[PDB]
Amino acid sequence: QVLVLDGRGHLLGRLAAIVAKQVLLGRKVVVVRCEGINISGNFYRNKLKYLAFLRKRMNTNPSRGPYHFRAPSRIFWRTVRGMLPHKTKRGQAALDRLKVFDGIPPPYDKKKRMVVPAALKVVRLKPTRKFAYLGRLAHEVGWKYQAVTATLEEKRKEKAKIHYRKKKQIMRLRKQAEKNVEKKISKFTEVLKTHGLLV
Amino acid sequence: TKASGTLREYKVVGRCLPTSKSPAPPLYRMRIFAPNHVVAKSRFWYFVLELKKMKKSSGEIVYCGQVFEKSPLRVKNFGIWLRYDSRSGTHNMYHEYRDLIMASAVTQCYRDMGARHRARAHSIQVMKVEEMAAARCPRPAVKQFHDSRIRFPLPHRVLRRQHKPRFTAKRPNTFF
Amino acid sequence: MKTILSNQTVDIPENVDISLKGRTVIVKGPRGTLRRDFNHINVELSLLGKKKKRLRVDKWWGNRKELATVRTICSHVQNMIKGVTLGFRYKMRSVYAHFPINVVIQENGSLVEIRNFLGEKYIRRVRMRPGVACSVSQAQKDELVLEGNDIELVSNSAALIQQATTVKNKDIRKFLDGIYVSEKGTVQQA
Amino acid sequence: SHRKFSAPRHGSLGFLPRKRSSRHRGKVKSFPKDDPSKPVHLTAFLGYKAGMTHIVREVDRPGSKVNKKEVVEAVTIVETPPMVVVGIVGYVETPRGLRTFKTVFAEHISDECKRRFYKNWHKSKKKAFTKYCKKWQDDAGKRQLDKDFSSMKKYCQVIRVLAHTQMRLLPLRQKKAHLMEIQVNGGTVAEKLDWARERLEQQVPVSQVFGQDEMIDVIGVTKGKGYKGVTSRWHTKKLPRKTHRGLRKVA
Amino acid sequence: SGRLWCKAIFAGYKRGLRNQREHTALLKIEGVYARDETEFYLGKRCAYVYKAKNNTVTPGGKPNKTRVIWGKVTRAHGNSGMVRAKFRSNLPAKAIGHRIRVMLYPSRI
Amino acid sequence: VFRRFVEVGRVAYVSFGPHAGKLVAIVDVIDQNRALVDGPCTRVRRQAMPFKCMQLTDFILKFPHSARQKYVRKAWEKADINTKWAATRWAKKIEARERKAKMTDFDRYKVMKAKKMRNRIIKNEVKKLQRAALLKAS
RNA sequence: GCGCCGGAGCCUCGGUUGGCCUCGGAUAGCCGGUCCCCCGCCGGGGUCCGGUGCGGAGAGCCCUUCGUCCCGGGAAACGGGGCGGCCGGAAAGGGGGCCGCCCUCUCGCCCGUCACGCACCGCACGUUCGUGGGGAACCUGGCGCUAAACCAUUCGUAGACGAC
RNA sequence: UGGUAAGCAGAACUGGCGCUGCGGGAUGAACCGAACGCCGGGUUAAGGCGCCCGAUGCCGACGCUCAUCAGACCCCAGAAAA
RNA sequence: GCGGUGCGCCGCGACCGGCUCCGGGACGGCUGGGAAGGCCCGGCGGGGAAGGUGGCCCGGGGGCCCCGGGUGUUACAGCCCA
């Protein structure tokens, strides 16, 4: 009962809006591949929007000032935080349910991760309009572990490919165990199809 | 008038009421595009007072009836002559539309004069709505649809119904 | 408004095999293979006729600034064929007043020495683009010849060795010294 | 209203938490970045500030007014007795930072290297690394040791070597040695770890780490002066003597 | 055996913005996300099941620590399958975003 | 690459609205985002209808852009779109989609008992196809 | 008197009421099969063939559970069940999949027989994850561990005092 | 009406605030809606309905617009000539 | 038994009435005594053009199959009027 959402190709506020609402409804959401999140408008605007965020620091002691979190996991965490009553207990109990990650760590790498189509760039942006990768945005404004995340993200894609190739292998066997075995599953199959499960 | 919903075309005829000097004054017919008959009978006086010495008090409405579509299935080309107030000065405009219905092609003018020019309905005065044969249509946004074998695909089919699952497990297809 | 359809056919000759996986094209012929990725443009690249004797680039329901993206793909692919058949050759002549701009190529063309530009003891080492190689050719005293398949790289790497020899903190109208793109042509003649 | 006569700012804010260093031995925050075409080498050493004296050398820089002319340079002698490698520690590369994968100590750790694992050496029964020692002299222990070097040549990317100072060879009062992770920057992680296991329980002289006429970086803690006023700490302008409530403070 | 109730979430009270009416709850029943599908649940019985420190009696059972505030799904709320419920004691704000059981057994089918 | 085109006399499947789940013919293109659509054999009246509601199918039948409802009816039954629809996999899995959503609680029992056993037979056989791979390389 | 593995019970904090064990990604494009051909140690590349309002569909899939007998028929025999080998796993390492027995039944799963179990007499927090987390001690069996920290004392690389 | 203007000074008419809560304008004496016994159900105003935050999670309709300073709701809280 | 009166606590149901918010059915009136459309066959007759069907030409795509120009009024499609 955990929404392991994919962060890749989603919009920063659109996803944060839906994450912030589910989490207030007692849902435990995991947003993953947060570097894959992209923000609408061209790159230079969104960087300038974040550079202006860096300048807003407490004059007399910046150690007290707004903690400008650089990692895409903590840029996404902050935009969810702004859409919660985080000064109250239910908005602090909210953020405890949300668990945000860059790349995709071990619990979730071997888990089918969901997609929000309402919070998705292909669905919600016109294809002509420019967008800004949170992976590139975070990197150029002080995030350190882009290239480290990118290799571990690549070391699991080639690992998770070998899973999928071995799943296609079982699925070839399953269909070839239906051509062969059709004479003795027929009376069972021909009541699935009367109820519209296979046609 | 609030140009609200789809407009209806009204035949509103009205006469300056019987006098001693003029017992039977000439009857005046108008094409009034209104959400309903009440504001058709309001906008009747607005245009008649602008043209004739005839306020609602020194006059009467003799027939306010809706004129329907005599070909509501034939897609037709409509040439609408405007008279709209800008923020500085008023402008004569000939504008073309392409609807089944005269009164909806006039609605399609009210949404567009808002869209382009930020002209709210009270600024606008529809003076003439004429069905035009497809050579007498200068504006090329209508002339592109004058094509026997018209053939376009639906290129980028952006899906709606984005919230019915809300948490699908597949990136949505947009090529159909 | 939205124009129902805008298209422009590229008459690709017998000598060239252009094929396309998606809206990416791959173009090969007498002198190498050129691949350009048009993912940014959002068009329909159709390849029609037997022998595929023309490319057809469709744009359906495009505004003024999206119909501009039909003839760009036309011209880009046309210069992706001229580079594949005839190549590209940007002959650029080194202008000077007093000091000979002393150019010799290291890295067999992939690097250009520029010595004695306005008596500058500093030496400029302009690395060429991947594919393009300069050559101090014969029959002209001051002469640089770039050769390459990509019109982009032969022209970009020409504008590297042009913007390298800029006159700083002087009147540029009097000091007309530098290496300037004198003739845009092809490697071999049609 | 503005600074009437513009002046630069007294002190830098590029160190500004002016506190007692919570480490007495200076941490190497940053070791050099490696290229695996280099030979395998320790990147750092650990010495003791012995003193200070003159030097006379004939300067060989052309162009200067002191070309082929003899100078007097002040020098610091740092007594650097050869350090004993007593362990290796692998660091896996993570998106949250750079996590310590696994530490592997040696069988025989020197009695002065033991003292660093104790606040009170006199009172203790001195049982540090007495169970870890037994991993080396049982047949089933060498195996799980060898499965670490198998794991730490595979998963790890940054290999650092625990090399303590030999305190016995110094005129200092203390006997408690200084442990220090020194980053072995050399070839591949496999070669890097085969090399450090070869140096395990072994001497490393300074010649292995540093050579002559080399530009290096000295890391250490400052000579402590205690609670000092703003005129002493920040070197601000003193106030002109007629001041009532003190002249040795920021106005 | 199996589950005889549907998964609803106490998603806050019936409230404007700067005033809340604690007498009516706003229930988010899982699956129903429109006013078309919320029509089945109108008049159904809804239970907020919790447990405390002290044992209390159980009707047709031995005293558990589990307790209830019984309610009733009064009418539909808003445009998106949210539903109004009204409990015999006003639900505590402890329960915000916790599971309440919309039952089946004011059944009309 | 586009296979289906808004063409004069294309059979289009209406997804949502008043006439959802019905094949309408595109009689004429009114506008940039609307078309005159008629389906006389599918009981859809000659009316304006936007392109957003209609998923246009792989059937095009010849009538002119101005043809009245009778001349659409001829071309609908000449091609016979009613029967040619219901043999398409799409049509067969709209009416399969209808069936599963009309499944009775007793019918839901008889399918569970079928699916359980129908899976047990294959899971035995794939596990025997699994040993038939391991046994080759020894 | 504490760390590992092997019943009876008292407190306490409560939330839950079956699982999904994973391609990468495209979007003016996709998904899944194939050898006459090709570079790669059986991977990619095509070519051809199917699917594409995703049906090798998350609009989905998997598990579906009153209990048991008696006797049948399909189904399984390459099966189920648990004791010692072999055979997996770093980004925050996990409960898997197999080839070998010492092994216990021919039962488990789908249709039909044949009878039965508080049928608690219309009624609510039922049914689970759950020998859940935490807190004390009690019966206990093997297998095991015998430490430091702080003060004090001293030093002066330190220091208002603590700290170091 | 005076004054370049002013959250300026001075009048006419009506309504407010003062004396007055409440819904909305994030927040404001006066704006907008509506004036108040204590309550249950219903329904509205003015405002709203991505999330904070009740409500568009309509398969809403047709257009306009790309900003390296977007724009975003009476009073009202930052602009002109060009 | 009836009538009054209550339950120790926790509950459930039934019908009746009040006020409510929705859903389903069915009937009728009016208009330009609706407008268009379906169905008989575009009944017989005459006409007009076009977003121009066949015919023919043009230009070239396919092993004879089909697109893109032109001509001009029904042919091997239809459309609006008298």
Q: Three-class SS string for chain B?
A: CCCCCCCEEEEEEEECCCCCCCCCCCCEEEEEEECCHHHHHHHHHHHHHHHCCCCCCCCEEEEEEECCCCCCCCCEEEEEEEEEECCCCEEEEEEEEEECCHHHHHHHHHHHHHHHHCCCCCCCCCCEEEECCCCCCCCHHHHCCCCCCCEECCCCCCCCCCCCCCCECCCCCCCC
Distance CA F12, CA C110 (A): 59
Pairing of strands D203-204, D70-72: unpaired
**Quick one: tokens of D151?**
């794991």
Tokens of C166: 């800029």
Residues 147-176 of B with CB under 7 A from strand I: 147-151
Cβ of residue B68 near strand I, that is under 7 Å?
A: yes
| B10 phi/psi in degrees, rounded to 5 | -120, 135
Q: Which tokens belong to A36?
A: 């894959």
Is nucleic acid strand H under 7 Å from E44's C-beta?
Answer: no
Backbone angles phi, psi at E17, to 5 degrees: -130, -55
For C62, phi and psi rounded to 5 degrees?
-110, 135
Strand G contacted by F78 CB (< 7 A):
no
CA distance C83 to C77: 10
Q: Are C84 and C27 in contact (CB under 8 A)?
A: yes
D and E touch with 3+ CB pairs <8 Å, answer no
Q: How far does the CA of D122 sit from the C1' of G152, in Å?
A: 14
Token pair for D81: 């007795």
User: To which residue do tokens 């409230």 refer?
Assistant: E15
Provide the Cα torsion C91, C96, C102, C107; round to 10°: -30
Structure tokens belonging to residue E20: 């809340």
Q: Are C148 and C135 in contact (CB under 8 A)?
A: no
HEC-encoded secondary structure of chain C: CCEEEEEEEECCCCCCEEECCCCEEEEEECCEEEEEECCCCCCEEEEECCCCCEEEEEEEEECHHHHHHHHHHHHHHHHHHHHHHCCEEEEEEEECCCCCCEEEEEHHHCEEEEECCCCCCCCEEEECCCCCECCCCCCCCCCEEEEECCHHHHHHHHHHHHHCCCCCCCCCCCCCCEEEEEEEECCCCC
Q: Is D8 exposed, middle or buried (0-12, 13-18, 19+ CB in 10 A)?
A: exposed
Chain E CB contacts of A25 under 8 Å are 9, 11, 28, 97
**Residue C75: both structure tokens together:** 């011209």
Beta-bridged to residue D158, according to DSSP, are D91
Among A3, A5, A155, A2, CA closest to A76? A5
CB distance F29–B148 less than 8 Å?
no
Which H or E element spans position A4?
A: strand A2-6
The answer to whether A130 and A38 have CB atoms below 8 angstroms apart is: no
Contacts of C9 (CB under 8 A, 6+ apart): C54, C55, C56
Contact at 8 Å (CB) between F36 and F89?
Answer: no
Q: Which amino acid is at A135?
A: G
Residue C119 backbone phi and psi in degrees, to 5: 65, 30
Whether CB of E90 is under 7 Å from strand H: the answer is no
Rounded to whole angstroms, the Cα distance separating A47 from A142 reads 11
Angle between helices D141-152 and D189-198 (to 10 degrees): 140
- Chain F neighbours, 3+ Cβ pairs < 8 A: A, B, C
Of the candidates C172, A95, B144, the one whose C-alpha atom is nearest the C-alpha of residue E97 is A95
Distance of alpha carbon D42 from alpha carbon D210, whole angstroms: 9
**Torsions phi, psi of D71, nearest 5?**
-115, 170
Tell me the CA–C1' distance in angstroms for F59 and H2: 84
**Beta-bridge mates of residue D91:** D100, D158
Q: How was this structure determined?
A: cryo-EM
Chain B residue whose CA is closest to F37: B73
- State the nearest Cα–Cα gap between A54 and chain F, in angstroms: 44
- Classify residue D238 by its DSSP letter: P
Is F23 exposed, middle or buried, given 0-12, 13-18 or 19+ CB atoms closer than 10 A?
Answer: buried
Chains near C (3 or more Cβ pairs under 8 Å): A, B, F
Task: Kindly report the backbone phi and psi dihedral angles of residue E79, in degrees, each rounded to the nearest multiple of 5, phi listed first.
Answer: -105, -10
Question: Rounded CA gap, D205 and D42, in Å?
Answer: 11
Tell me the C-alpha distance between D166 and D162, whole Å: 13
d(CA D186, CA D41): 6
Residues 6+ apart with CB under 8 A from C157: C126, C128, C129, C132, C134, C146, C148
Query: What CA–CA distance (Å, rounded) separates E86 from E91?
Result: 9
DSSP string, chain F: -----EETTEEEEE-SSTTTTEEEEEEEEEETTEEEEEETTTTEEEEEE-TTSEEEEEEE----TT--HHHHHHHHHHHTHHHHHHTSHHHHTTHHHHHHHT--HHHHHHHHHHHHHHHHHHHHHHHHHHHHHHTT--
| Closest residue by Cα to residue C5 from C56, C57, C61, C65 | C61
β-pairing verdict for D99-105 and E5-15: unpaired
Q: Which residues pair with F34 in a beta bridge?
A: F31
Contact (CB, 8 A) for F33 and F71? no
CB C52 within 8 A of CB C25: no
Closest-CA residue to C124 (of C152, C162, C181, C98): C162
A129: left (phi over 0), alpha (psi -120 to 50) or beta: beta
Which residues, listed in sequence order, are joined to residue A30 by a DSSP beta bridge?
A4, A99
Kindly tell me the sign of the dihedral angle through the C-alpha atoms of A24, A27, A28, A30: negative
- Provide the CA A182 to C1' I76 distance, Å, integer: 51
Type of residue found at C80 = M
Q: Does E28 touch chain A (CB under 8 A)?
A: yes
What gap in Å lies between CA D201 and CA D108, rounded to an integer? 7
Asked whether residue B146's C-beta has any atom of DNA/RNA strand H within 7 A, the reply is no
Distance separating alpha carbons of residues C189 and C182, to the nearest angstrom = 18
Report the alpha-carbon angle C50-C51-C54, nearest 5. 85
The encoded tokens of residue A28 equal 């435990």
How far is residue C118's CA from residue C102's CA, in Å, rounded to a whole number?
Answer: 11
Adjacent-strand bridge partners of C35: C26
What region does E96 belong to: left with phi over 0, alpha with psi -120 to 50, or beta? beta
* Residue reference for tokens 């996300």: E33
**Buried-exposed string C88-114: b where 16+ CB fall within 10 A, e elsewhere:** bbbbbebebeeeebebebeeebbebeb
Q: How far apart are CA D54 and CA D75, in angstroms?
A: 6
CA atoms within 13 Å, Cβ hemisphere of A68: 17
- Do F and A touch, counting CB pairs below 8 Å (3 needed)? yes
**What is the Cα–Cα distance from F64 to F8, expressed in whole angstroms?**
7
Give the H/E segment covering residue D48.
Answer: strand D48-49
Could you tell me which residues come within 8 angstroms of residue D76 by beta carbon, excluding any fewer than 6 positions away? D49, D50, D51, D52
Closest CA to B159 of B144, B174, B147, B140: B174
Burial class (CB in 10 A: 0-12, 13-18, 19+), C45: buried
In angstroms, the CA D242 to CA D66 distance is: 49
Q: Are strands A2-6 and A28-32 parallel, antiparallel or unpaired?
A: parallel
Q: Which phi-psi region, left, alpha or beta, contains residue B46 (left: φ > 0; alpha: ψ -120 to 50)?
A: alpha
| B162 contact A CB<8A | yes
Is C55:C10 a contact under the CB 8 Å cutoff? yes
Rounded Cα–Cα distance for residues D171 and D161 (Å) = 26
Tokens coding D233: 């700490």
CA-based end-to-end distance of chain D: 16
Question: Residue B2 and residue B120: Cα distance in Å, rounded?
Answer: 8
Packed helices C64-85 and C151-163: angle between N→C axes, nearest 10 degrees: 90
- Specify the length of chain A in residues: 199
D140: left (phi over 0), alpha (psi -120 to 50) or beta: alpha
Exposure string (b/e) for D134-166, b if CB count within 10 Å is 16 or more? Answer: ebeeeeeeeeeeeebbeebbeebebbbbbbbbe
Q: Residue A26: its chain E contacts at CB < 8 A?
A: 9, 97-99
Could you tell me how many residues make up chain F?
A: 138
| Cross-strand partners of C58 | C7, C44
Tokens 């989603």 -> residue: A10
